[PDB]
Amino acid sequence: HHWGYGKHNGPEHWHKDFPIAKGERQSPVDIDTHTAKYDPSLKPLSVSYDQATSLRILNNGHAFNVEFDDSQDKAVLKGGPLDGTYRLIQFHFHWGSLDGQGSEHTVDKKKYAAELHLVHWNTKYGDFGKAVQQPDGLAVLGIFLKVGSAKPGLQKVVDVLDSIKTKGKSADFTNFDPRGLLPESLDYWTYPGSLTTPPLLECVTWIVLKEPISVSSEQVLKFRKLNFNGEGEPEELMVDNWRPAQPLKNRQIKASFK
């Protein structure tokens, strides 16, 4: 049946409809920091979000996506391990029922409270649906969230969530600046992997930032009041929407820093 994160349709079941789930380059993974190799051949990341145009925020039943206008090169990622230009299409988060879990990537087996994914697609493939069919189709910027001080730039997101509580609800969400979600440092780890939700396609260059951002308990608590279900269905809190770490297999994680 339809996939989700419960006991009967969670990540351990996905391989039955999506056999690539047991593939050779599945995400997320544990980042073993001692084994990642510094690659001095790696460039600095180029995040150019000055002209970003957010449009809408949507509860899609798994997460909430903040969507952007990607019909022009307004918000792009380049540099780092990437060839070419990748356009921002949406960002979303993965989070836990408790502060001790929620991220998808782990760092020396450490789990963070949440993980932000800024999803970008390679403009050489013309649109997102074509890009996910290519091994270099997507570039996803992963940022860990730890609980501590509030993230001022997150509050506009937190405050609209009660308007999209249930699956299928959307709201206008313009003039949101995703630069306010970035940590100070852009040091990163990178490896080839996959989408972390079905269809689990192996099309992603992952770029995971070393430095987490901090958010407050109140901010993450508001994530946890969302619902997986549709309006007028039994309430299932949207929590623990993370896939756990998958086998690294024949892959090397590279680090941009020493």
Ligand SMILES: [Co+2]
């Ligand atoms: Co994600």
